[PDB]
Amino acid sequence: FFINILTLLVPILIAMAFLTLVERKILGYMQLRKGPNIVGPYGILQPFADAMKLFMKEPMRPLTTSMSLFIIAPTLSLTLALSLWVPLPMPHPLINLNLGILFILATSSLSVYSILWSGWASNSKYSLFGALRAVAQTISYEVTMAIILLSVLLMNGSYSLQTLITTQEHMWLLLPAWPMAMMWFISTLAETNRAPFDLTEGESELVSGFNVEYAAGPFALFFMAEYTNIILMNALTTIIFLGPLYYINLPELYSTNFMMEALLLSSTFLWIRASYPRFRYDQLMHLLWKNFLPLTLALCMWHISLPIFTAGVPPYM
Amino acid sequence: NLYTVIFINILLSLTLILVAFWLPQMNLYSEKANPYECGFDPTSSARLPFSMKFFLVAITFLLFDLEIALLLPLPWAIQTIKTSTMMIMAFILVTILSLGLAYEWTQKGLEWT
Amino acid sequence: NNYIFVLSSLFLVGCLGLALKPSPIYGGLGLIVSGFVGCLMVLGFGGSFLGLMVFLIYLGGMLVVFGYTTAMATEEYPETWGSNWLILGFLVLGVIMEVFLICVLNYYDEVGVINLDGLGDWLMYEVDDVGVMLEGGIGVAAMYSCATWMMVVAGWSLFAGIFIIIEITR
Amino acid sequence: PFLDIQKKLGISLDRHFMFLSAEQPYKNAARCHAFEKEWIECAHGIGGTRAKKECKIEFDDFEECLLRYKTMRRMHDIKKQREKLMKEGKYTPPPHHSGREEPRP
Amino acid sequence: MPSTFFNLTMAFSLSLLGTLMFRSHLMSTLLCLEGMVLSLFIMTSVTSLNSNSMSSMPIPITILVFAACEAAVGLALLVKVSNTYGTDYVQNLNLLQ
Amino acid sequence: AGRISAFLKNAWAKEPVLVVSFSVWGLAIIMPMISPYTKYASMINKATPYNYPVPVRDDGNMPDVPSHPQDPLGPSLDWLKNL
Amino acid sequence: IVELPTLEELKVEEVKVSSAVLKAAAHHYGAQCDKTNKEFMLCRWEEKDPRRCLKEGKLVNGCALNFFRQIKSHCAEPFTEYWTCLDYSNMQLFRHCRQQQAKFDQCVLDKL
Amino acid sequence: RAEYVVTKLDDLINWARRSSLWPMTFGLACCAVEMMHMAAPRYDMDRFGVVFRASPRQADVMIVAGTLTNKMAPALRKVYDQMPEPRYVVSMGSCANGGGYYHYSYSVVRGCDRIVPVDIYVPGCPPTAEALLYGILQLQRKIKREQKLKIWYRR
Amino acid sequence: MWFEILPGLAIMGVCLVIPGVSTAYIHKFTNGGKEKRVARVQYQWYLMERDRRISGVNRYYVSKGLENI
Ligand code: SF4
């Protein structure tokens, strides 16, 4: 089991490091740059050197900060971001929860708790601004996102994650639920703070947000947690909505199709980052409570009525 | 199982904090540990009272989170035998939530003060 | 094997720190440590829905409770658990009172409350082995069908809560 | 009730989950369901003051079932006698209690 | 079970001692009130789990919804107190004598 | 009768999200009342085996309650196996 | 004294047949052995007495081993194919190996 | 042999800092446009792996661009002092080198050498984006050829 | 060109197709050619507990078919 822990936790770190590499390369090719060509064979040794620069640089111990929350927020942030992968399905999961969608929802809010403790105990006015726009960002996203997960699991009757692939064996859930799918992709952009809905990391209205005073080390480990959340909710959107064909004789063919689909979804995520301009904390909350919450309440209404109109009551397992 | 995965995640991130702190060289002084705000010292203390501007929409975020935790047993309540009163109860409370958000939308407290 | 008693002593420690009342920014951290402890307690007891449901509803409430602590009720030089020494002395006094309470509670009562090799054996009373519905999710699913007045009164509480909060914050 | 409007209109609104022995989703009976059923059907309109001396045996059996206090006391003296007998060395443990045997299903 | 339930009763007696005194803020008292919300949920779910009375599972979500709704009412009450004062403290509220 | 149509088309052109939400809301309200498969959901949730329906005692009285499980007597499921 | 039966009363021929192979011979068990099994559940729901229903416990164990004796004597090899195919899957889902089920029911209708 | 292991660990710890060094989204000048032109995709930062972060706690090298006035001097030293301990400074342009224009002004600090250490002086009023991309190559080889663990060993 | 990103994206695809294939193969090697049973309800857990007590070597995965009966 610990062999499965090490061989699931090491190559997800290699995968998010290469996600930061293909972020810099895909934003480069979007922006007519070439991306980090000069180190490694085509870029491969850049994020290993980024970790080996940012972990052999030192962090601060500031006077103004609180030291216990300063050292206990980023250890949480890497633990929760690497611990949302353990109920993820693949063919057969590392850990099969009975109800794992609530674990994904709650511990995804606990990542924003790590961000929020960084924002308060970093103890800058910039960091307090970043903490309160984390609060306003989750005020925008959280009710909408859980109504989306509820209203799609009115088609798959349990909260289990293997039940999603035995529901999505025959067809994807993009085709019955594309008004769910577009607003879920927008809401998980709001979850994982990417460049349309990236406030709270900021970089173009304020300086850094949650990691203003957080130097190298804990800023790197937040960066580890943030891009782990990027590849995580890319894979979660990939398994829940465009979940591929599932063969019980060939799970590796389905895993290759799932990984081509997940690299397409991650390229779509970074493509959205280098295609759209950035929101505001007022307009973000405004349209995620105005143009989303009546629409996702009506989609909750329609998927409540969907085991009555077409009489598909979902099974328990 | 899951307690051991959570604890090896604790051990991995604590090992990363220990290799982030104890291995690099570090000299620290008062201007280095001075808090950053644009290149100057801050005007007041950084924990001075914020006057909050999203307060009523913050409380209806809290009450909407209580409604979605009310609405969380509904994927197993779709399997019940009294499905007429189940769908009437789900209809009347999603109508209650849409009318409450429509009241807040007409009263225009979504904008800050 | 002693999971629920170790977690319940940790809940006693976290509610003791919340009871000893720091700056409420730090009190939200202590109460959400107690919330993770209680979610893991219900998930170790057999409620696979109720612990994660209180983690969702409590993380989502306590987020903006934390935001209201760091906006409204903040202070220039706050008090954590280690700032004020009467609070720190009360913390170590409550810790030694807790372990003195269990050190007198395994000896006075002569019943099965605390035993060094006989605690944790009386935790699961009865779950059905061949039954199919033993988790807590279908019973709280039954408030849509059997106990419909609960959902009527909770939806009216939230409707009146929206109207009452608009009238308070106006 | 004070205003007995549920008994007046004849519709149960909070009354169908009042005790432990009420009806349950998908017919899964609670623990001490038979004890609660025999306690209510022994207090079936007797009254409170006469019932607390009449069905005191059935309440005492149901309270013993629900809280298991004399049962945990019995198992506490059994486990204390097991620790005393293992410290004495008289009690050879059986292999069925030790677990080193083929089990029946 | 009686060790867990008596330690939850001790946690409620501790949070009673917490919300029955005031140190500097009304908000830490409201955090003690929400500690009472969490302690009553854990106590109700532990009682329903070991008694296996799964028909009374509508009760602890009603505990959470009503007690967190009145907690949200008190959180915006502290917002209106700090709006009408500018301060927040317990000793600020002696103007009704 | 042109004012309601002009207001509906103006809201459709300007802010169509509330129009789509109220239309899908009214469709979800009225579509169980239209569809004939509303009555099949209670049939599905009744005719699922979910516990053990226990055998009953007999004195030679009832003929509808069968003895063999493959008897034609009782509530059959030709509306579910074939449909 | 709460009465409990002795260990020699519980000296039955216990069925040494596993989970997925029992799930393979689930519906044929309910097809064939329907008198003794429903007698045992009628005892256990109107008597509430596991000290009393042991004498029908011997009958339902004898019917289960007679049913498996008929299968083992007559229809062993498509049963081994079908229960190995059912034991391959995760939750013993019946959908994955319906091709073996037609061979199993054709062999059972041929011989038994 | 231990000195070979020490020098190869020194090269392995300096390879990361010479490749993935992270500069500063600075400003202040005419010379702010040419930092943006090294960001521009003709002579490119990000091909080397040279990323404009905004925070001084996350930065690794400071590109001081152009004029450094008397009001800007604590607003430059405060930022450099809150850079963490591998701190390299490029001075873009002649006003950050020694005060190209406004050497004799009342309100220019006469170069960035008066305030912080500057590890490479890149001259021009335009340093072209290729010219201080050469400058980031020369700082890259400078902290390649520095010896930290070697003089930790012989000490 | 467009084929420049695809080496790094291909080793990303290899190193992210390795944990699901690795956890399916280690579930097969854990449960001896069979897959790990999932206990969504209590009946599946009592079924797996009875599977362990039928096998008798404290093992879920090995099972007694008609070779014992
Ligand atoms: S160095 Fe030249 S180009 Fe740069 S700020 Fe000075 S005058 Fe302008």
CSV table of C-alpha atoms in Angstrom, one decimal, chain A residues 116 128 131-133 135-136 139, chain B residues 49-59 111-113, chain C residues 63-73, chain E residues 75 79-80 82-83:
chain,number,residue,atom,x,y,z
A,116,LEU,CA,-6.8,32.7,4.2
A,128,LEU,CA,-5.4,41.3,4.4
A,131,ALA,CA,-7.6,37.3,2.6
A,132,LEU,CA,-10.8,39.2,2.3
A,133,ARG,CA,-11.0,38.8,-1.5
A,135,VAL,CA,-13.5,35.3,1.4
A,136,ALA,CA,-15.4,37.2,-1.3
A,139,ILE,CA,-18.7,33.7,-1.3
B,49,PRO,CA,-10.1,47.5,11.5
B,50,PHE,CA,-11.4,46.9,8.0
B,51,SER,CA,-14.8,48.3,7.4
B,52,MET,CA,-16.4,45.4,5.7
B,53,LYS,CA,-18.4,46.1,2.5
B,54,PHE,CA,-19.9,42.7,1.6
B,55,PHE,CA,-21.6,42.0,4.9
B,56,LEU,CA,-25.2,41.2,4.0
B,57,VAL,CA,-24.2,39.2,1.0
B,58,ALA,CA,-21.7,37.4,3.3
B,59,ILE,CA,-24.5,36.4,5.7
B,111,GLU,CA,-23.5,46.0,-4.5
B,112,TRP,CA,-21.2,47.2,-1.8
B,113,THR,CA,-21.8,50.2,0.4
C,63,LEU,CA,-14.9,31.1,6.6
C,64,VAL,CA,-17.0,34.2,6.8
C,65,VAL,CA,-17.1,34.2,10.5
C,66,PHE,CA,-13.2,34.3,10.2
C,67,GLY,CA,-13.6,37.2,7.7
C,68,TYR,CA,-15.8,39.1,10.2
C,69,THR,CA,-13.2,38.5,13.0
C,70,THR,CA,-10.4,39.9,10.8
C,71,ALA,CA,-12.6,42.8,9.6
C,72,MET,CA,-14.8,43.9,12.5
C,73,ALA,CA,-13.6,42.5,15.8
E,75,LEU,CA,-22.5,37.9,13.3
E,79,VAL,CA,-21.5,44.1,12.1
E,80,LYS,CA,-24.3,46.6,13.0
E,82,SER,CA,-19.3,48.0,14.9
E,83,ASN,CA,-21.1,50.1,12.2
